[PDB]
Amino acid sequence: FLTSILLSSLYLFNRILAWQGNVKHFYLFASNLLLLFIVVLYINFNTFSNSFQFNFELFNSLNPFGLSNSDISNGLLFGIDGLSLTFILLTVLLIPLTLLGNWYNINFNSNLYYTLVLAIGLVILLNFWALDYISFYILFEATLPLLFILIHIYGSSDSERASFYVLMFTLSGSLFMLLSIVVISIVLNTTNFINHNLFVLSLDLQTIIWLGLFIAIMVKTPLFPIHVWLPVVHSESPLAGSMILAGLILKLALYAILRLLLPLLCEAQILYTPMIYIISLLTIILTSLATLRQIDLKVIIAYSSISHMGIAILGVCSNTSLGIYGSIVLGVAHGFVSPALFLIVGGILYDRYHIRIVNYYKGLTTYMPQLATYIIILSFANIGTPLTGNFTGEFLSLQGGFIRNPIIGGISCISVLLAAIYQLKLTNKLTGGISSIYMHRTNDVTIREKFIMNILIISTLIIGICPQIMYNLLYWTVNNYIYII
Amino acid sequence: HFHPYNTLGLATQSAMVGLGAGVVAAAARNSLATGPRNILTTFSKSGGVVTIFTGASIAYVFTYCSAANLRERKDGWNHMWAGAATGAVLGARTKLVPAFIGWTVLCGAACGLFGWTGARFNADRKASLEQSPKGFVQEDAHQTFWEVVHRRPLSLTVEQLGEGRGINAVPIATATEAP
Amino acid sequence: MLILAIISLITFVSMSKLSDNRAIIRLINIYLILVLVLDSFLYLLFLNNQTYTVMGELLIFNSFTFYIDMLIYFIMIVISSLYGYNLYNNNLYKTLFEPKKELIILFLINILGALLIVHSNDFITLFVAIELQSYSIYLITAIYNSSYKASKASMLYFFMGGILSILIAYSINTYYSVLNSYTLHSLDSLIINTLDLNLILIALSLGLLFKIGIAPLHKWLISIYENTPILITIYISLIPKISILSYLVLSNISINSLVISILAILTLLVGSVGGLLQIKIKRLLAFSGLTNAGYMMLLLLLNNNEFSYLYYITQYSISHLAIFMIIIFSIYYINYINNQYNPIIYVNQLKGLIHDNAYLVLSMAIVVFSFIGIPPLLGFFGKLNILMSILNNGYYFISIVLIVASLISALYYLYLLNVSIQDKNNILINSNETVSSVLSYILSSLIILITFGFIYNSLIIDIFNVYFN
Amino acid sequence: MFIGTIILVLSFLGFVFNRRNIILAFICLETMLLGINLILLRNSVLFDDISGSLFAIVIIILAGVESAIGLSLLVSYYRLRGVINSYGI
Amino acid sequence: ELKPSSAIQRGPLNKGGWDAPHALHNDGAIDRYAHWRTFYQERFKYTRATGKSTLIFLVAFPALIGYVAYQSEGLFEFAGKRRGESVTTR
Amino acid sequence: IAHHVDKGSLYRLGPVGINRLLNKASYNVINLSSNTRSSLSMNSMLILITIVSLLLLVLVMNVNFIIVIPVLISILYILFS
Numbered sequence A: 001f002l003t004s005i006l007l008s009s010l011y012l013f014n015r016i017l018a019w020q021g022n023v024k025h026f027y028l029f030a031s032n033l034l035l036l037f038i039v040v041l042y043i044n045f046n047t048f049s050n051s052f053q054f055n056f057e058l059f060n061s062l063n064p065f066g067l068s069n070s071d072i073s074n075g076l077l078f079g080i081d082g083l084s085l086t087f088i089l090l091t092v093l094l095i096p097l098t099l100l101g102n103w104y105n106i107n108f109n110s111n112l113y114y115t116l117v118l119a120i121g122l123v124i125l126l127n128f129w130a131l132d133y134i135s136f137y138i139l140f141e142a143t144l145p146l147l148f149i150l151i152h153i154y155g156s157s158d159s160e161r162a163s164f165y166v167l168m169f170t171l172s173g174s175l176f177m178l179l180s181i182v183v184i185s186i187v188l189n190t191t192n193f194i195n196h197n198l199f200v201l202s203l204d205l206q207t208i209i210w211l212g213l214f215i216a217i218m219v220k221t222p223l224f225p226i227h228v229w230l231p232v233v234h235s236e237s238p239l240a241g242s243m244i245l246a247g248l249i250l251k252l253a254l255y256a257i258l259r260l261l262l263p264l265l266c267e268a269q270i271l272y273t274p275m276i277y278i279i280s281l282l283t284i285i286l287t288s289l290a291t292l293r294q295i296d297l298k299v300i301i302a303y304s305s306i307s308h309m310g311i312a313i314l315g316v317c318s319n320t321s322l323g324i325y326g327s328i329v330l331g332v333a334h335g336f337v338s339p340a341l342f343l344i345v346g347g348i349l350y351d352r353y354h355i356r357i358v359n360y361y362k363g364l365t366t367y368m369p370q371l372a373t374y375i376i377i378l379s380f381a382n383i384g385t386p387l388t389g390n391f392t393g394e395f396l397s398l399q400g401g402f403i404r405n406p407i408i409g410g411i412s413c414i415s416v417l418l419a420a421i422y423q424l425k426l427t428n429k430l431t432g433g434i435s436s437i438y439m440h441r442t443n444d445v446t447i448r449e450k451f452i453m454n455i456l457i458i459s460t461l462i463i464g465i466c467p468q469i470m471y472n473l474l475y476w477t478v479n480n481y482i483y484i485i
Numbered sequence B: 001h002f003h004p005y006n007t008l009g010l011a012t013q014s015a016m017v018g019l020g021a022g023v024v025a026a027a028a029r030n031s032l033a034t035g036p037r038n039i040l041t042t043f044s045k046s047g048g049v050v051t052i053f054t055g056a057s058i059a060y061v062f063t064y065c066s067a068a069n070l071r072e073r074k075d076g077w078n079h080m081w082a083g084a085a086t087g088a089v090l091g092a093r094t095k096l097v098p099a100f101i102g103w104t105v106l107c108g109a110a111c112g113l114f115g116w117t118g119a120r121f122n123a124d125r126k127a128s129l130e131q132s133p134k135g136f137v138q139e140d141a142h143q144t145f146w147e148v149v150h151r152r153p154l155s156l157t158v159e160q161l162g163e164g165r166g167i168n169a170v171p172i173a174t175a176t177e178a179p
Numbered sequence C: 001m002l003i004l005a006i007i008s009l010i011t012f013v014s015m016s017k018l019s020d021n022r023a024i025i026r027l028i029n030i031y032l033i034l035v036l037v038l039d040s041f042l043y044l045l046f047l048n049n050q051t052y053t054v055m056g057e058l059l060i061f062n063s064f065t066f067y068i069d070m071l072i073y074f075i076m077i078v079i080s081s082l083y084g085y086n087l088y089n090n091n092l093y094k095t096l097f098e099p100k101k102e103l104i105i106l107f108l109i110n111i112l113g114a115l116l117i118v119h120s121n122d123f124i125t126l127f128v129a130i131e132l133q134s135y136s137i138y139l140i141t142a143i144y145n146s147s148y149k150a151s152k153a154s155m156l157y158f159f160m161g162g163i164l165s166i167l168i169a170y171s172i173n174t175y176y177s178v179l180n181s182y183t184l185h186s187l188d189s190l191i192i193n194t195l196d197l198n199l200i201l202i203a204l205s206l207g208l209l210f211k212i213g214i215a216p217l218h219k220w221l222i223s224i225y226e227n228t229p230i231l232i233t234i235y236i237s238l239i240p241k242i243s244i245l246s247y248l249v250l251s252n253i254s255i256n257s258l259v260i261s262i263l264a265i266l267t268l269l270v271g272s273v274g275g276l277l278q279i280k281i282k283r284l285l286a287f288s289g290l291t292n293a294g295y296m297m298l299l300l301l302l303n304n305n306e307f308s309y310l311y312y313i314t315q316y317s318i319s320h321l322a323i324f325m326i327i328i329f330s331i332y333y334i335n336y337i338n339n340q341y342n343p344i345i346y347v348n349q350l351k352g353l354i355h356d357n358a359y360l361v362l363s364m365a366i367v368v369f370s371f372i373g374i375p376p377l378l379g380f381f382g383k384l385n386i387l388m389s390i391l392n393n394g395y396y397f398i399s400i401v402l403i404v405a406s407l408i409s410a411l412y413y414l415y416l417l418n419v420s421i422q423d424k425n426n427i428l429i430n431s432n433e434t435v436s437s438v439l440s441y442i443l444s445s446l447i448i449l450i451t452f453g454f455i456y457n458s459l460i461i462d463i464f465n466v467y468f469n
Numbered sequence D: 001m002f003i004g005t006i007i008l009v010l011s012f013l014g015f016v017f018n019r020r021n022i023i024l025a026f027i028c029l030e031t032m033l034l035g036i037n038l039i040l041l042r043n044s045v046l047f048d049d050i051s052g053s054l055f056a057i058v059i060i061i062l063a064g065v066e067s068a069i070g071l072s073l074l075v076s077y078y079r080l081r082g083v084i085n086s087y088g089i
Numbered sequence E: 001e002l003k004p005s006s007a008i009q010r011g012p013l014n015k016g017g018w019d020a021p022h023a024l025h026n027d028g029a030i031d032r033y034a035h036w037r038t039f040y041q042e043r044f045k046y047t048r049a050t051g052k053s054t055l056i057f058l059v060a061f062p063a064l065i066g067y068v069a070y071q072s073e074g075l076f077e078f079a080g081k082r083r084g085e086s087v088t089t090r
Numbered sequence F: 001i002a003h004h005v006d007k008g009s010l011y012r013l014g015p016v017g018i019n020r021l022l023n024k025a026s027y028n029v030i031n032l033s034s035n036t037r038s039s040l041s042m043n044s045m046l047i048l049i050t051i052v053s054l055l056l057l058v059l060v061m062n063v064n065f066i067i068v069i070p071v072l073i074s075i076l077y078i079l080f081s
């Protein structure tokens, strides 16, 4: 049955490629089918169980091609809790929006581009299903060649250096992640997201293991020593690469610090949270300050994403239920509101004028009133202006970080000010003034751009008016990672 | 414990081995070259090689043994300080201050990462996972390095971590109970 | 059955004309295929790591060495397909990829000498087989004698192989002068404690290892690999590597050696940063072999390293084979053919390869990302299982040097990609003649192995568990 | 062991610092093989066995075959360049 | 005599589609300024102002808030407190 | 911060300084055998140097391991610079 579904489906695909040159209609169709499938899975999800509900094993020895019903299991496990399914819902409603986001600008070799974008989306979808450390790690770096090819073939003038940096920095942190994963797999002889809180390592073996995982998380939720590939890989990517990156990869490393570190490095983690607070306060302040002198326009939103991830990390590392919940709300709400900003700068503003320097853009209200409406609504939604989901995440993460250490909570609370300075400094320059003498007047915002914007604004407003709507997934996982004896 | 180092004589021995290594490398550069070269161009057209060898040898072993005698314990920090001194000597041939500082800090970081892994190219035998007790403890004992248990002693948690943040010598539940 | 082929073959080749050489190679190709298919059931001999010694403790046959001979036969089937099949039917590729009359003779004699090293138990079998394969590489290098570079390379390889063979002979007779013995089966766990065999056994391993291309003495081999023609160098890069390393991994005489660790650190360093600013594709391609031989010098320090070794061997062999075959295929699309023996030299000559045969670039990208060690591909599990043996056994500085070396080596691997996915002005639209069905199927098989070979990891570990334990 | 060691060492250093022609390199290679023979046959006599004599009679034949192979290699080096340089190949 | 084949038919590459008319007048001064700022690092050099900034923001400020963060870990509880009650522990 | 720290000194420890370090180290190890007109004398003297030098190193190295670390640091310095 299940094989006949697939070679029906492969024949479906071959015939519509034979009769239609493009793929994008079928990729949109498969994306929305994947949406409906994940929401049917959410209907059948048991919230009253802490355990992993929809389990499957791939590449077992008794059945290498397909599912596994065995006494012995050495393949790759997959399955979800509420924590996984939160990010799966966030991922699956963003994949059609990034396929839709480049519906007209990619002209030359379209089918390659849409295949790469859908492939990256599928890899990141399967990242949240994984249940081994090696099964997490394999999909965790399957993205990188596709990102390299996507950034190198499509982009601006400088897409060679950006493609190199997205392979280089990510690979360089993630190799030390592999070091710690190998040490875990030779001590425990098991890599598993199920059993791994039962095993207790020695304190100085834990403090050796924890370093390599935290270095990779410092590279990928980019904290201050290496926060540095991120503005260039944003500022020189195509549109769906930027959107998928800043909506999903950074939140994937935010998911990895919960899933991989907090269960079997508890006694290490307590010894190291002051160092994490040094690094996260120091990547809030110094990056939020370095945004004030920026000549380019996508680079400002890249540095914004740094500062918001720095707020979220002191939520997960807070040893508080409030901080864990607020970091999850911040990750999901940021994954909504930031790709809308990258669409504002890269889609409505780079398709029309093909330059990204700030000095050309002035007085956009008088020819584009509803674009300007979007720009100011998204600016305030990005700041931490409430009823938005960004303030719920920032408020609960700042509260957890105040519980764990009140002085670094006191100096971390100024991120409310620092995040608003550069954002409103950009927004009043874009909206205010006489219309630019460099810009000739173009079209106002189109139906598909307004469609993407309206979806990404409603989904922040619903979380911002009621953050309880996703507590039913998280109330286990908010208690799961707390170590208060 | 530890016993104090012979900074005097280890530094003399290091100056001897650096002098010999400079002799050998200057002879090697003499033999592997072009042009009019004779027997006493070994120390004129050497490129300053004996200075490199002896200066690095004196600097590293002096700073290593001095830092281990000043700190009165032996770990990888002494390799950090001695590599910083070696990077100072190797960076002074660069007559430039920022490159000098770069040589100092980066050679000290590389040598400290070297000395923290054991300061050995090869392996240690009994420290290996292959030649150590591993797996579960089979009954309750002092859990060694490379070993796994199911539950840890809470007294070890209080002594190693602290009595502060969320961590206490008795859980919050039974500290607050009705009788 | 190699002996049969040599005995039959030189008889048959002396009577053929030069018009028949290519067809002769086709015959031998199919012959070796039916030695794989019809005769591999001998794996049933080696249950539970049962080991035989043959010819009076002269040869040793276990399942490790059975896997190595299967690997060498598979690679010889690929290489002999590359000689015996035309790329295109042009008057171009006939004057470029042309076999000599005595090429397949020297191929099979070299495969014989390479098998009698891995299957070897005593030191004179080791010696005689080392010189058999060394004279064969001398003559395979010198057989395209209408070439200045290949003649100079054969002379250089003669002298540098002669020194390092006399060093092996000195180490063997030096071992004999302290032990009236030839076996390392003589050693048996107690003699090593009460006898200083360190200097002997390490000098033996070093004289064996400098022929691979380990780091102080690497440049002469890089020059031989750049000077030989493009079909010869895919064979002489692979076969001494896998034969000599499969000897030195099976015999554990340099366990926890300080000298081998120094030279492994130095090999990983000088191969990674050595091939960075290099503009010739075989140079670029040979420093990759230098680093990937460093990763084996690491396993020489190990006890019980047979999984990590054999996995990373067939990994490197498939990846090596495929990346040379892809740049064989890119010769059709370059705007400039020099140098009849070595028609593509500079790596910028493959610059617009995505706009002419984009699936060749898909091929190329797959094998280059497997060289880097990207997790969906087969090179990742090789590097992973090497790390699982390095960290298990206490080599902590070696681990970080391995990681930094792989990160530095990723630069010049991706430089191939960076060149090939680029804009080109005059692109192909319509070409009349086709690439060989027989020979492009081999490249596609080698890719499908690399991409979808992670599927069978657990099957392979279970079959490993039974036949080696 | 003295005569074989010193002929091997002096033969090796005469090979290494050869800058004058190419056939000095060949004959220094052959004298290296002679020194290896000397050391081994002395050890066979001192240990009262043939097995060093076995390896010595095999390495005689291998030295001969390497001389034949390598001198044909020099002839093919000479085919296209009717001169052999003094500094080397 | 080594020329790639007679049967190639190679021709020029086009991107394809519509040439959008120019919506933006380039500024040479703004483009040169922004190209100068984007690639600022390849002309960056160490000076005294650079050294002041590097030591102040990379070593001095991390050491300062490091001292503050390690001195004050288990100091403060403010959860349920009253008048005359300590809010620190040590 | 945006010029002297983020684009200035975090790139000297990052992609801008590593490119220059690797450029210099690769140039030095490629010019390691640039000198002589001869291939053969060059490589056969190179074989002599190492089987001398390694033996000298282990002669140092079983006496004391501290006095051989700066020897190897200096060998890396003259090899890569």
Ligand SMILES: CCCCCCCCCCC(CCCCCCCCCC)(CO[C@H]1O[C@@H](CO)[C@H](O[C@@H]2O[C@@H](CO)[C@H](O)[C@@H](O)[C@@H]2O)[C@@H](O)[C@@H]1O)CO[C@H]1O[C@@H](CO)[C@H](O[C@@H]2O[C@@H](CO)[C@H](O)[C@@H](O)[C@@H]2O)[C@@H](O)[C@H]1O
Residues within 6 Å of the ligand: A176, A179, A180, A183, A204, A208, A211, A212, B074, B075, B076, B079, B115, B116, B117, B118, B119, B124, B126, B127, B128, B132, B143, B144, B145, B146, C391, C396, C397, C399, C400
């Ligand atoms: C980018 C990230 C970089 C990360 C680098 C971290 C490397 C840090 C290494 C830590 C580590 C290897 C663990 C690595 C495991 C996986 C590592 C993953 C890959 C890492 C690549 C090497 O530990 C080394 O630490 C050095 C200093 O830290 C020492 O230096 C030297 O100091 C002076 C010598 O006397 C010299 O005088 C000076 O000359 C040297 O300088 C070394 O001697 C020591 O071996 C620890 O292993 C060891 O720890 C000890 C103490 O528990 C274990 O103790 C045993 O077990 C308990 C009961 O049985 C008892 O309690 C304990 O008493 C007992 O003895 C051992 O079983 C052993 O296992």
Ligand SMILES: CCCCC/C=C/C/C=C/CCCCCCCC(=O)O[C@H](COC(=O)CCCCCCCCCCCCCCC)COP(=O)(O)OCC[N+](C)(C)C
Residues within 6 Å of the ligand: C036, C037, C040, C041, C043, C063, C066, C067, C070, C071, C074, C307, C310, C311, C314, C315, C449, C452, C453, C454, C456, C460, C463, C464, C467
């Ligand atoms: C009719 C068949 C004729 C015989 C065909 C034999 C061809 C030899 C080819 C060698 C290179 C191609 C890779 C093939 C790997 C085979 C794995 C294997 O089975 O090797 C075993 C494990 O290997 C190990 O430890 C480690 C081996 C690592 C393998 C890593 C590569 C993984 C992906 C490629 C292999 C899977 C491809 C399967 C595609 C269906 C060890 O030796 P065995 O005594 O059990 O062999 C028995 C194989 N027989 C039954 C076909 C003779």
